[PDB]
Amino acid sequence: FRKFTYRGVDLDQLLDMSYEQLMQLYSARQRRRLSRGLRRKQHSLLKRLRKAKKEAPPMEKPEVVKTHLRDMIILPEMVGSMVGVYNGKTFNQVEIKPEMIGHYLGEFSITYKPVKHGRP
Amino acid sequence: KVRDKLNNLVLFDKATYDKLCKEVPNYKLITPAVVSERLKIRGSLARAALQELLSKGLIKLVSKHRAQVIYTRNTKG
Amino acid sequence: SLVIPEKFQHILRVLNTNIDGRRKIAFAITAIKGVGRRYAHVVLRKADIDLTKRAGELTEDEVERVITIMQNPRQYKIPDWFLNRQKDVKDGKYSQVLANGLDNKLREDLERLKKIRAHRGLRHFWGLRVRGQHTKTTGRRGRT
Amino acid sequence: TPDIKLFGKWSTDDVQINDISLQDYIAVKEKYAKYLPHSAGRYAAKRFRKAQCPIVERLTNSMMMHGRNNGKKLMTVRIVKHAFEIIHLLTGENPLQVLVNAIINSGPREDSTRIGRAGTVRRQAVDVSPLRRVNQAIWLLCTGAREAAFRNIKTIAECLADELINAAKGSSNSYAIKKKDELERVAKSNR
Amino acid sequence: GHQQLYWSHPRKFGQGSRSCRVCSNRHGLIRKYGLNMCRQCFRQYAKDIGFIKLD
RNA sequence: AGCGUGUGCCUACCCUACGCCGGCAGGCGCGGGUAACCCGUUGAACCCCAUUCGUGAUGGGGAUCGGGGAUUGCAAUUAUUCCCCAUGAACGAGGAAUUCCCAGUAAGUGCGGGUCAUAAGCUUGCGUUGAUUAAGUCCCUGCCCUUUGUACACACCGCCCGU
């Protein structure tokens, strides 16, 4: 019943805004990342990643798209999306909640297993 | 082997003030350390009381330093 | 002056915590959880209260003004970079928290991380170090 | 006009040495009398060249120990000068005489040597050389003032001041006299 | 896209942008005064450069 | 104060005075040096003086942790680094044992070089302040020479007797 609010604005308000003010809506590192340059030199992968995310399955569970890019900052436009990101061995298929904003795909795929020691 | 955790008063009560005014100008060496030891008060409080007694003129200055100061009584003659 | 004044309040009951009155006012208010040494000098500089007095002889109007500076520090011209909690993920406001908002908001942030399932939240749930340091040689007081 | 080498404001003359065994090892009289307890150096080069050093300079050099105080000569010099101020204002006696009489009274005159293998407790009584008397006396005065001025409200300028006068009168409330006479007791216990 | 993904990796900066100019190894490089080799090659060829171990 | 270093071949990445903006980390147009000329008289630290503190896990100690802002790089998350405000744990001079040293020496204290796009708790140099003790011994751990003993010689960490 609770309605989520990020930085005083609503989810559809976050979708219908642009990067030029969204950099100030982000933190210090994410502003530096988005203000660094064009997503063309290596992030044509990111360009086609948001293209493949903008491909729209019908009104069901959306289709999972998987990628090797662990440096992808969650835009507000891709909330409620199904994605599995590579940790090196397999793909951890994760549901994008409306809380992901301000992080990476590497925040949500663990690499090391949690260790459980036995006998020395 | 008694601990006896000291609890020095931050300001003077009634008995400490006249005890100081009758006994401190009757001692040989006066430093804030020995005033805090004998009168169970704080170090800075002893410094403020000694500055007041210096301004009153009943204590002569010997040497001043950022570590400690040296005070003595008046000549009884 | 140096003689103890009348109604010299020894124990100060401020913001449901215990505050000694024998300490300096620039340092006796630092016993409150959330406020430290650096921000204490700014508060007693905005209010017209000198730093040369102990906390045990101040009275209701000056400590009430200091409590207003505690609760609402923004419109007493305290600069925005001096605060501990800035640019909130819930509402986006600049505020200073004094142990209650501080404790419950730290708890809410930790349960937010544990619910969001970030590896910072998983490391806080497991009880390990989060800032990315070596655990092989240190942290020997973890568990028996 | 150099009429007298006044040690800041104290006169290096009219000071009496009571022991004749320490006459040529304590140099404060009329030749090795300086205005400061800080000289240049080349004093620990040969074997017995430290016997010509001024006794207040030896006390100043032995004042600094325990890591965080090594090399701070100015700070130990001003401790020495302030301690001389309390010594002069406290007894009415010249402060150089108090230094001389304390070292004579705090000198251990008989020693026990560890003899045998490692672990066995055997002691053999020997007497102490007069230079080593002064040496352990200065070391004992310095460590007594050092452990008096530790985690205490009383400053080192006062803790050093009370330590010599208790050694000067032989009241045995000082720490140097305490180790001196337990060392004499151990040397007396097995001879 | 073999031509455009063969060596699209930037080796502009980093350790592997430079190498030993004697034997081409990437460990223990000496970059001071522009020698640009490892320590072993400098020790082996140090006499003809003019470096003498006088001190 | 003294050793230093400084625009590099593919190789792009140098050291910096000066002016403004901003608490700060930092940002822009401006001038020098390919070096005894410019940073630079390298206004370094420890020390010195003057306040505040007063034996209280305290204004000691800064580990752990939250939020925010800049720089480097194509890319920081398992925080590169730096800055700001909070958070203020253990630790009250350390058991058995063990390391280094004797004169500008130990020790305290900072500055250069190496790694370096971003970069020192390491290392190599440098400078400041500057001592206690001793001019000896073979007791311990070992070394050199002579004599003697040996069932050892892959050499006592050797060889060997019996239930």
UniProtKB/Swiss-Prot annotation, chain B:
The keyword tRNA processing does not apply. One of its GO terms (molecular function) is structural constituent of ribosome. Keywords: Acetylation, Cytoplasm, Ribonucleoprotein, Ribosomal protein. The chain holds residues 38 to 114 of 124 of the full protein. Belongs to the eukaryotic ribosomal protein eS25 family. This is Small ribosomal subunit protein eS25. Component of the small ribosomal subunit. It comes from Oryctolagus cuniculus (Rabbit). One of its GO terms (biological process) is ribosomal small subunit biogenesis. The modification N6-acetyllysine is found at K5, K14, K22, K28, K56. The keyword Nuclease does not apply. The modification N6-succinyllysine is found at K14, K56. Component of the small ribosomal subunit. The ribosome is a large ribonucleoprotein complex responsible for the synthesis of proteins in the cell. It is found in: Cytoplasm.
Swiss-Prot record, chain C:
Component of the small ribosomal subunit. Keywords: Acetylation, Cytoplasm, Isopeptide bond, Ribonucleoprotein, Ribosomal protein, RNA-binding, rRNA-binding, Ubl conjugation. The keyword Secreted does not apply. Its main location: cytoplasm. GO terms for molecular function: rRNA binding; structural constituent of ribosome. There is a cross-link at K90, K93, K105 (Glycyl lysine isopeptide (Lys-Gly) (interchain with G-Cter in SUMO2)). GO terms for biological process: translation. InterPro entries: Rbsml_uS13_C, Ribosomal_uS13, Ribosomal_uS13-like_H2TH, Ribosomal_uS13_CS. It comes from the Eukaryota. It is found in: Cytoplasm. Belongs to the universal ribosomal protein uS13 family. Component of the small ribosomal subunit. The ribosome is a large ribonucleoprotein complex responsible for the synthesis of proteins in the cell. GO terms for cellular component: cytosolic ribosome; small ribosomal subunit. This is Small ribosomal subunit protein uS13. The modification N-acetylserine is found at S1. The modification N6-acetyllysine is found at K93, K105. The gene is RPS18. The keyword Iron does not apply.
Curated annotation (Swiss-Prot), chain D:
There is a cross-link at K34 (Glycyl lysine isopeptide (Lys-Gly) (interchain with G-Cter in SUMO2)). This is Small ribosomal subunit protein uS7. Its main location: cytoplasm. GO terms for biological process: translation. It comes from Oryctolagus cuniculus (Rabbit). Gene3D superfamilies: Ribosomal protein S7 domain (1.10.455.10). GO terms for molecular function: RNA binding; structural constituent of ribosome. It comes from the Eukaryota. CDD domains: uS7_Eukaryote. InterPro entries: Ribosomal_uS7 (IPR000235), Ribosomal_uS7_CS (IPR020606), Ribosomal_uS7_dom (IPR023798), Ribosomal_uS7_dom_sf (IPR036823), Ribosomal_uS7_euk/arc (IPR005716). Belongs to the universal ribosomal protein uS7 family. SUPFAM superfamilies: Ribosomal protein S7. Pfam families: Ribosomal_S7. It is found in: Cytoplasm; Nucleus, Nucleolus. Keywords: Acetylation, Cytoplasm, Isopeptide bond, Nucleus, Phosphoprotein, Ribonucleoprotein, Ribosomal protein, Ubl conjugation. Component of the small ribosomal subunit. Part of the small subunit (SSU) processome, composed of more than 70 proteins and the RNA chaperone small nucleolar RNA (snoRNA) U3. One of its GO terms (cellular component) is nucleolus.
UniProtKB/Swiss-Prot annotation, chain E:
One of its GO terms (cellular component) is cytosolic ribosome. The keyword Lipoprotein does not apply. Its main location: cytoplasm. Zn(2+) binds at C20, C23, C38, C41. It comes from the Eukaryota. GO terms for molecular function: structural constituent of ribosome; zinc ion binding. Keywords: Acetylation, Cytoplasm, Endoplasmic reticulum, Metal-binding, Methylation, Phosphoprotein, Ribonucleoprotein, Ribosomal protein, Zinc. Binds 1 zinc ion per subunit. It holds the Pfam family Ribosomal_S14. The modification N6-acetyllysine is found at K47. The modification Omega-N-methylarginine is found at R11. Disulfide bonds: none annotated. One of its GO terms (biological process) is cytoplasmic translation. Transmembrane segments: none annotated. Its cofactor is Zn(2+). The modification Phosphoserine is found at S8. Gene3D superfamilies: 30s Ribosomal Protein S14, Chain N. It is found in: Cytoplasm, Cytosol; Cytoplasm; Rough endoplasmic reticulum. Component of the small ribosomal subunit. The ribosome is a large ribonucleoprotein complex responsible for the synthesis of proteins in the cell. Component of the 40S small ribosomal subunit. Belongs to the universal ribosomal protein uS14 family. This is Small ribosomal subunit protein uS14. It comes from Oryctolagus cuniculus (Rabbit). The gene is RPS29.
